[PDB]
Design an enzyme around this catalytic site. Structure first.
Site, PDB file in Angstrom:
ATOM      1  N   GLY A 177       0.825  -1.195   0.000  1.00 12.00           N
ATOM      2  CA  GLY A 177       0.000   0.000   0.000  1.00 12.00           C
ATOM      3  C   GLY A 177       0.864   1.252   0.000  1.00 12.00           C
ATOM      4  O   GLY A 177       2.000   1.234  -0.472  1.00 12.00           O
ATOM      5  N   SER A 220       5.671  -6.250  -0.277  1.00 12.56           N
ATOM      6  CA  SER A 220       5.998  -4.823  -0.350  1.00 12.56           C
ATOM      7  C   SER A 220       6.073  -4.279   1.071  1.00 12.56           C
ATOM      8  O   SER A 220       6.878  -4.795   1.866  1.00 12.56           O
ATOM      9  CB  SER A 220       5.002  -4.129  -1.280  1.00 12.56           C
ATOM     10  OG  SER A 220       4.791  -2.785  -0.887  1.00 12.56           O
ATOM     11  N   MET A 221       5.284  -3.264   1.438  1.00 10.69           N
ATOM     12  CA  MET A 221       5.347  -2.718   2.791  1.00 10.69           C
ATOM     13  C   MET A 221       4.958  -3.754   3.838  1.00 10.69           C
ATOM     14  O   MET A 221       5.381  -3.653   4.996  1.00 10.69           O
ATOM     15  CB  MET A 221       4.443  -1.490   2.904  1.00 10.69           C
ATOM     16  CG  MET A 221       4.937  -0.267   2.144  1.00 10.69           C
ATOM     17  SD  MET A 221       6.730  -0.068   2.172  1.00 10.69           S
ATOM     18  CE  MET A 221       7.000   0.377   3.887  1.00 10.69           C
ATOM     19  N   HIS A 248      10.242  -6.865  -3.236  1.00  3.89           N
ATOM     20  CA  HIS A 248      10.278  -6.030  -4.429  1.00  3.89           C
ATOM     21  C   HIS A 248       9.184  -4.968  -4.364  1.00  3.89           C
ATOM     22  O   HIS A 248       8.117  -5.176  -3.781  1.00  3.89           O
ATOM     23  CB  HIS A 248      10.121  -6.907  -5.675  1.00  3.89           C
ATOM     24  CG  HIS A 248       9.523  -6.205  -6.856  1.00  3.89           C
ATOM     25  ND1 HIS A 248       8.173  -6.227  -7.131  1.00  3.89           N
ATOM     26  CD2 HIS A 248      10.097  -5.485  -7.850  1.00  3.89           C
ATOM     27  CE1 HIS A 248       7.938  -5.542  -8.237  1.00  3.89           C
ATOM     28  NE2 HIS A 248       9.089  -5.079  -8.691  1.00  3.89           N
ATOM     29  N   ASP A 292      11.440  -9.444  -9.355  1.00  2.00           N
ATOM     30  CA  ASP A 292      10.000  -9.594  -9.150  1.00  2.00           C
ATOM     31  C   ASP A 292       9.722 -11.063  -8.850  1.00  2.00           C
ATOM     32  O   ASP A 292       9.484 -11.870  -9.749  1.00  2.00           O
ATOM     33  CB  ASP A 292       9.239  -9.111 -10.381  1.00  2.00           C
ATOM     34  CG  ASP A 292       7.729  -9.108 -10.187  1.00  2.00           C
ATOM     35  OD1 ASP A 292       7.235  -9.678  -9.191  1.00  2.00           O
ATOM     36  OD2 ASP A 292       7.030  -8.531 -11.047  1.00  2.00           O
TER      37      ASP A 292
END
Ligand SMILES: N#Cc1cccc(CN2CCc3ncn(Cc4ccc(Br)cc4)c(=O)c3C2)c1
Ligand SMILES: N#Cc1cccc(CN2CCc3ncn(Cc4ccc(Br)cc4)c(=O)c3C2)c1
Ligand SMILES: N#Cc1cccc(CN2CCc3ncn(Cc4ccc(Br)cc4)c(=O)c3C2)c1
Ligand SMILES: N#Cc1cccc(CN2CCc3ncn(Cc4ccc(Br)cc4)c(=O)c3C2)c1
Ligand SMILES: N#Cc1cccc(CN2CCc3ncn(Cc4ccc(Br)cc4)c(=O)c3C2)c1
Ligand SMILES: N#Cc1cccc(CN2CCc3ncn(Cc4ccc(Br)cc4)c(=O)c3C2)c1
Ligand SMILES: N#Cc1cccc(CN2CCc3ncn(Cc4ccc(Br)cc4)c(=O)c3C2)c1
Ligand SMILES: N#Cc1cccc(CN2CCc3ncn(Cc4ccc(Br)cc4)c(=O)c3C2)c1
Ligand SMILES: N#Cc1cccc(CN2CCc3ncn(Cc4ccc(Br)cc4)c(=O)c3C2)c1
Lengths: 180, 179, 180, 173, 178, 178, 180, 179, 180
Positions: free
Chosen positions: G60, G89-90, G114, G159
């Site tokens: 996000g 991610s986060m 990533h 990725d």
């Protein structure tokens, strides 16, 4: 449903043969690109035969309107402006930019120089930079109506339209005709 | 609705502009504009690779890789290119404006020139957008003949320049009112 | 509006491009783009099977089977195919670019070349089929870059763009030029 | 816009080469167009072979069956060519070519599995038509066609040739 | 909003206390979950006190209507069915699934068994035939009709009178008053 | 409107029955709620069985694995029940119940074939890496071979409750309470 | 349709009584505001009783995720992170920010560091400034996984997802449990 | 879904934050936020006009007149106000951040502070937006104790600052990692 | 979510504002806003007809008849009405602000006050009726600012905003304060 007149043109291509550049409706980069090409083409035919510019516009993007103005000053032809119906915001600036003594308006027209608060910017612009654009119209209006900067800034703070006679005394147009 | 002119052939006014060796760059710059602009630049070279070509610029910017594609074609062809700024030339638009042949980059008196990049194609990573921005740093410094950090500083500034500041800065060469 | 050029005959500038044996692959690649490219490829060969054919590539990618369809035609025809990367060549764009005739794969100085595939296809697709597709992407990429299959599996895992000099060093193109 | 060759447009020139394109999803509008040119190319000559370019993900069954019946009606030899993919009804027209003249380019994907308002019994009735068409042109038994169409997968052009859907997998002429 | 009755319940929670389960409107997984829970809750209260079901449904998802049908056949309570307004497609299968002799209908209702042309995902052709064969057997088991008679009548895009549905086997009683 | 029983709402009383309801498509919100109830039912007793109700068409794979891991984490024996359908992730949770306590009602429909979603768009090697995770779980609980599982899931079809019982997805097929 | 458990709470209010802060789904300013309040409240009850943080998130807004991280470092309680389903991610940055030796993951989870190329910015941001934000994650990841900056920058250019064992050896989590 | 805490009363966690004399400023700033924020600031004064009030700021900015309304109320009440920056405080958000009681304007280490105005209410004229911007010039210079043109220059720059640059610049006083 | 305050009894903070005799006029003014304001105005008078009533005004305007409806109630009730301008008071907002009890019309230091009407009403309206409406806007404005009717017709033609000091000098408010 655009008609065809008689070798046969459409009525809008025929208007360009009488040296009439048409500026109807809101002004954007597409209208400015089309108008500037008609002016540059009409000078290529003759740089002394006058050009008539029909204006029935409520305004539009300022930089697009300024591009037309800058091109009107570039070409060497006498430019005749005609206000039909209404000439508001950038439309009245082009109306006032005609050759001195050749800026006309029809008897039942409306003229506005106040600037609206539907576009006017292309992208997003900062607070100081709309002020610089407004100062550009401040000087262009004063130069073509021969009015003081203070009178111009004052008149443009009032949300109102003028009759062709009010606009004549102010300096936007020269003649108000019902008939040639 | 595009009008028709007669000069015996019947062209549309934009097909007549290409006859004058005039290439129009109006509006946002995407891959459709880059395909159209590059094609005319390549065609105008085929007619004669030494006659100058005029580029009219009234653009707010747009896709970076498409604007870079036009710029590369501008440096590729052999004709001297005159750039002309009416209205405005912001972001990629001023890059093409400053990319004209030295001595023939013009603007009209009431134009606005922005070199600040806005905020294009698919979304990318942080290292790729930073890689792209440095190409804009080098291209601007190449044609303005300014220092790199002088360019990098001037691009942080959310502002436009009058045609005169753009002339001292190195984006333009001449500011005309009349021919 | 697409402009018109005159020889004598009047051509639209894109139709004139086809007479210079230039086939444009601009924008996203789908079945409709594949139909046009393949149709132009086969027509240019019918005029002459030895005259070179030029392919302009400014593409961010598209459908795999649609992009593979073009590559299959580039391998079928006998003409020398010069690929030109202008602006960018990403995903399926770089595969066509690398599929050009050896020694005639060019790129313009400020182009970006990506071989990373996006995170598609026409109809909803299964797991084993997507990997079957990526495996033939590996084989075509390894065949034309002369790289190891695992060197193609690697670097294709990198969400990264290459310069024309990197793409030349890696085997996607042969030349990067500023002037002819 | 589609270019102009010499003065023809490229898709009108493809028809003059006796090539009929079946690209994209198949509906009644595409079926009406394909049938019109198939009858015109027979009107020009009833012996000259006709080439069919197939790059389709499938489409409406009654429209795909409309094309199929026309290729069986016409007396010309028909060469089908697969570029990209031939899925659902697309592979049925591919396999509907004249025996010995069904081709595919090397990197294509062939699918005979059908994608998952008429009554239920009509869906099964239409499927049995598809089964019999596939079995007729592939020379495969019905239960082999039924069990294979049951698998949600694509084939290699070499796999589709041994199965009977096509005949030639070529790289160059 | 739904009003409040004082004895303080909302009226729909009060019909629950009367052991009434409402199947109003289209049937989906959300309706089946709510209906099954109400059914299982009433069996925990008393496995012998009858349960009343009010059917005013145009139909809906087949697997959702089967989860309801399998749940009523699961519990051992005597289940009545009451057709109010209309019972079409899946609605009439549940209406016929009441305890024999306790399936009722109001006189001006419309009963339909022909199936429309039921989606959670798009399914294959044999999977809609496998599902229709389930509807065949369930209908024939509760109407006591032959499987051939079920396939014929379900092919007719028509509505039945409650009187006609009685001698067909879908319901048992057509009453105006208690 | 969810009815109220005597003051509970019917789905809160289902949780009092140690019943966790998993109806509909599975996403991160459904996974969060299901995991929360499983850990709560463990808090009141770590040895009393928990009941899971499955009528699902599938859903997000990572959310479905989030539930499965939590079903394996808690110490309670888990009964799984299939009503209506259990497809894709829904059939995997159905197969992941306590050995000998996985049930299905007679008119259910069980599919293990995966649909042709997931919070982010991902790459080819990740989609297939996830499929191997499903291969191992299905083979673990059905006690089938890896090849038999990966062959059967490429079939686009549903199974009856008895077919799934012979395959190893469930253990008992009941019509009435035992 | 959120249940009620037994004084009677809802199941989400009951989770907070067991000192469990729930982070499910995409992260925005609303999720960060709710999460930070639960952490600050839980420290007010006791600054030594551990707090469990359940993470099933795809990522996000970065500044919203960094606000949670900054608050995790502010409070003095031992913070236990649990990865369920996926932490990308986060989400994987918060997972890696747990108290050393108390970062767990369930056996069938996926972990991504990533960064995606669906929000990540609140407003519009410049090219240099996404680089400064990326450099912030570069150092936070290296600090909590004890990995070099080069290894971190390299791994984040790929990725791909990692298994809990891959993420364990890399330094995001400490234990992979099927059972207590 | 807002959870419920027990400390006997049952509050929602945000009603419990107001119990701690904590006022949250999260998200875009409009008239709805200004009405909510001003009400809590006035209520927290009524309980005791001398106890400090804490304002948490994670905002990207928003409507200028609404952000000015909050700022005026911040200067109106008598309580010392601690500002706290988590995540970010851009445009009007950093103005409220810098408007805290001198010596108690904090930020957490990974926050981003922007004072560049973006690009609100009804559209206005060029003289009115320029009039509004000069109030932002004076307010920033008042609490940063910087020169006017130093502020006017720093606001052209499309950039964020780390909490440390914002501290030297005068927007913050303390940058904390732990209590 | 509207927070809750506790005395003992639990109030929502907006309901607590009404017990302090504060009536909020925030946002655009329409019939629904008029219903609430008038209902709160009449209730506060029923408790006491001499205790002051506070009106918080942060409004950009709204429907004329809806705004007039409130003004009619402010004139009807006997209570002293202190108007407070916070943020901005434009169009119908400044009319209510100027309609406060003389000597108790305040504004906060950074507020903007406009009396220019926008370039509306509930149902489509005729020419003579719009000017009948603007004429009673002139009369109410002239009555409460103690200005000449033409000084109200003027300045209302100016697309302009006033400072609290200008609005104090012109007669819209009486005080502009920073602290109590
Ligand atoms: N935007 C634009 C714009 C506006 C004003 C002046 C210019 C300068 N340019 C430079 C090159 C040029 N070349 C040919 N002509 C004659 C001509 C003939 C037919 C057509 Br149709 C159009 C033009 C020119 O007038 C100019 C002026 C640009
Ligand atoms: N994207 C693109 C692009 C941009 C710059 C250069 C090139 C190279 N190509 C290669 C082949 C080629 N062949 C013929 N001409 C002459 C010509 C004549 C008429 C028209 Br109409 C267009 C071009 C070329 O200029 C080139 C240059 C590609
Ligand atoms: N998709 C497609 C595709 C791709 C590669 C090869 C083929 C094979 N086909 C079969 C029939 C055919 N018939 C005529 N020509 C010459 C020609 C002339 C004018 C135009 Br306009 C286009 C082609 C062929 O090249 C072929 C090759 C198909
Ligand atoms: N749907 C359809 C369809 C499909 C296959 C066959 C037929 C039968 N019809 C009946 C009448 C007819 N009349 C003339 N021709 C020759 C022709 C010439 C030019 C064009 Br253009 C099209 C056809 C026929 O082929 C037929 C065949 C119908
Ligand atoms: N889908 C579903 C479904 C359908 C039919 C049968 C079952 C089996 N289950 C297993 C566990 C269970 N545990 C408690 N009860 C009593 C009860 C009391 C109150 C409520 Br409210 C709900 C149920 C049961 O009836 C069952 C039956 C599942
Ligand atoms: N996603 C998630 C998830 C799934 C499985 C295990 C865990 C680990 N956690 C860590 C801390 C914890 N603390 C208390 N309990 C008991 C409890 C009581 C009431 C409720 Br309501 C919820 C839980 C735990 O079970 C755990 C297990 C996380
Ligand atoms: N964004 C935010 C944020 C993040 C970390 C630290 C701080 C600093 N603040 C300052 C004032 C304050 N006042 C009271 N408490 C205790 C408490 C009790 C109950 C609840 Br519910 C919430 C907090 C504090 O922890 C702080 C810390 C801000
Ligand atoms: N927009 C607005 C605004 C902003 C700042 C100051 C004021 C002035 N007003 C005037 C009347 C008034 N009356 C009571 N209190 C105390 C109080 C008690 C509980 C709550 Br809940 C809210 C306030 C006041 O603070 C004021 C200040 C207006
Ligand atoms: N629109 C409206 C409106 C505006 C101004 C005056 C009136 C006249 N009405 C008539 C009847 C009436 N009856 C009771 N009260 C006292 C009261 C007590 C509680 C509440 Br809560 C509200 C009012 C009145 O003030 C009036 C005045 C109407």
């Amino acid at each position: 449903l655009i008609p065809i007149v008689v070798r046969a043109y459409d009525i809008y291509s025929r208007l360009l043969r009488e040296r009439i550049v048409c500026v109807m409706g809101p002004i954007d980069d597409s209208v400015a690109s089309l108008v500037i090409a008609q002016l540059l083409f009409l000078q290529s035919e003759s740089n002394k035969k006058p050009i008539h510019m029909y204006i029935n516009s409520p305004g539009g993007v300022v930089t697009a309107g300024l591009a037309i103005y800058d091109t009107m000053q570039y070409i060497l032809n006498p430019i005749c402006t005609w206000c039909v119906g209404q000439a508001a915001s950038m439309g009245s600036l082009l109306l006032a930019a005609g050759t001195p003594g050749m800026r006309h308006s029809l008897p039942n027209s409306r003229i506005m120089i106040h600037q609206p608060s539907g576009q006017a910017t292309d992208i997003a612009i900062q607070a100081e930079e709309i002020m610089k654009l407004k100062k550009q119209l401040y000087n262009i209006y004063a130069k073509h109506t021969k009015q003081s900067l203070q009178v111009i800034e004052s008149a443009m703070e009032r949300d109102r339209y003028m009759s062709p006679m009010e606009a004549q005394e102010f300096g936007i147009l020269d003649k108000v005709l019902v008939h040639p």
